Design a protein around this ligand. Structure first.
Ligand code: HEM
Ligand SMILES: CCCCCCCCCCCCCCCC(=O)O
Length: 458
């Protein structure tokens, strides 16, 4: 001995399923995890997942020799349109490593230096929009963040312009992405999909996916012509060949990586830049500190690569935002063999472990008692932080390929936002967190008066 494991309330045949009959499943699971602690079992009709909340257990699950990435029920649903791309394939699925190798040089420090110019293009457009608002007006934060993040990935990665800033409503691709992620979440809590009560759902689902796939076609079409060709993420998808297998990617898989990187390459970064600004307005002193570093370092009209790299405190602000609200709030692992977790819990081959990231980031035994407060200075000495305490970019070889992309874009943009503007929480915003598997504040609005510093170029 050995336990034994805590389980939340059950509802007969459906077991734990009713508990997440909410538009906010992750957040509910955090509250469940507040009461039950480090580990709890969740069972739905014919599936069982153990949710982990503590560093001492999550460090173990992060042992790549014992546990490997698992497609959760969530990821299996996302696989309907993510296909067999990097996010939704098994580690030992031929197409994972093949694509990993092929696409990896598109995230090397030399690619970032080359993505910078286009990152600034989109950032300048956002600043300009904010500069051009009338005094009677406010900024819709996540809406504008999504505008930036999608346009950024679309240009740096595909040399395609979404022109999100030439639209006052969300881009159709986003509307369709949100509806498709929204359904994926809503299949988690129904376990009766056949029912023609869900006939309209799968009709709109297929409608959304076609909208997404129609865009990919335009992206590929634009590439074939072009001429003055770039050397970006798409160029590697078409021309790169994998040393191990000696193979290029097949067209079926390319289509899936375009959809994967268009979605996973912006959505969570949008959430990050939203949550980051929110915390900064709720915490006006750290904002000031961030504004000072911004102003001191960004001495040119347009930031260089080296200058973003110098925005140290901004980096800490984004990390602390990732601590409290990691925008991809969970990842799944399975036991490679029969094993015992933390000396107390016996697991069978292929049992599921969901890492509840936000709860991991609130483990008092790691972060000290003040876990709920926003304090970027925690990351002044990361060496003190134990291994596998901070995991907002996943784990191991299945960790986020686009991590430095997200951060660099988020650092540049937040840095520029703070140089050019003073922000005001005019409505005194109360945090509502929308759940689309990913996490993002809903209705978060602010006002910005211009610091009237000039811009433009590069
Ligand atoms: C704050 C911004 C971001 C967050 C919080 C984030 C979060 C994550 C997490 C938690 C995983 C691991 C998934 C899992 O274990 O199931 C992951 C993997 C991945 N992310 Fe990100 N990500 C971010 C930015 C990006 C960007 C900008 C891209 C595209 C350039 C991207 C593309 C991917 C891909 C392709 C994988 C899976 C790769 C593989 O398995 O080889 N991510 N991300
Ligand atoms: C942009 C890529 C999207 C991939 C999804 C990443 C977010 C992790 C999944 C969160 C779902 C958590 C809800 C619990 C689901 C359940 O057990 O029923």
């Amino acid at each position: 001995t050995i336990k034994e494991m805590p389980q939340p309330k059950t509802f007969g045949e459906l077991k734990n399923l009713p508990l997440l009959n909410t538009d906010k499943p992750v957040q509910a699971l955090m509250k469940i995890a507040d009461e039950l602690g480090e580990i709890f079992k969740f069972e739905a009709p014919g599936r069982v997942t153990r949710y982990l909340s503590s560093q001492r257990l999550i460090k173990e699950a992060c042992d790549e020799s014992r546990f490997d990435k698992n497609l959760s029920q969530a990821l299996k649903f996302v696989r309907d349109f993510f296909g067999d791309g990097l996010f939704t394939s098994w580690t030992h699925e031929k197409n994972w490593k093949k694509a990993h190798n092929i696409l990896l040089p598109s995230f090397s420090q030399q690619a970032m230096k080359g993505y910078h110019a286009m990152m600034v293009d989109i950032a300048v457009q956002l600043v300009q929009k904010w500069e051009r608002l009338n005094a009677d007006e406010h900024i819709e934060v996540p809406e504008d963040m999504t505008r930036l993040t999608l346009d950024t990935i679309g240009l740096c990665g595909f040399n395609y312009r979404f022109n999100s800033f030439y639209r006052d409503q969300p881009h159709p691709f986003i509307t369709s992405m949100v509806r498709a992620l929204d359904e994926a979440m809503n299949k988690l809590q129904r376990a009766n999909p056949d029912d023609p009560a869900y006939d309209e759902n799968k009709r709109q689902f297929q409608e959304d996916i076609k909208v997404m796939n129609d865009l990919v076609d335009k992206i590929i079409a634009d590439r074939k012509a072009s001429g003055e060709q770039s050397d970006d993420l798409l160029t590697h998808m078409l021309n790169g060949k994998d040393p191990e297998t000696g193979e290029p990617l097949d067209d079926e898989n390319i289509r899936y990586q375009i959809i994967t990187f268009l979605i996973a390459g912006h959505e969570t970064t949008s959430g990050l830049l939203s949550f980051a600004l929110y915390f900064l307005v709720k915490n006006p002193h750290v904002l000031q500190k961030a504004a000072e570093e911004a102003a001191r370092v960004l001495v040119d009209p347009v930031p260089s690569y080296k200058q973003v790299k110098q925005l140290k405190y901004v980096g800490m602000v984004l990390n602390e935002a990732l601590r409290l609200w990691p925008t991809a709030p969970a990842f799944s692992l399975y036991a490679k063999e029969d094993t015992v977790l933390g000396g107390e819990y016996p697991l069978e081959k292929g049992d599921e472990l969901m890492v509840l990231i936000p709860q991991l980031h609130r483990d008092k035994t790691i972060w000290g008692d003040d876990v709920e407060e926003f304090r970027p200075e925690r990351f002044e000495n990361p060496s003190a932080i134990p291994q596998h305490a901070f995991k907002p970019f996943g784990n191991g070889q299945r960790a986020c390929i686009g991590q430095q992309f997200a951060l660099h874009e988020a650092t540049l943009v937040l840095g520029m936002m703070l140089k050019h503007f003073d922000f005001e929480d005019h409505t005194n915003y109360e945090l509502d967190i929308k759940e689309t598997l990913t996490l993002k504040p809903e209705g978060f609005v602010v006002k910005a008066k211009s610091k009237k510093i000039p811009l433009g170029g590069i």
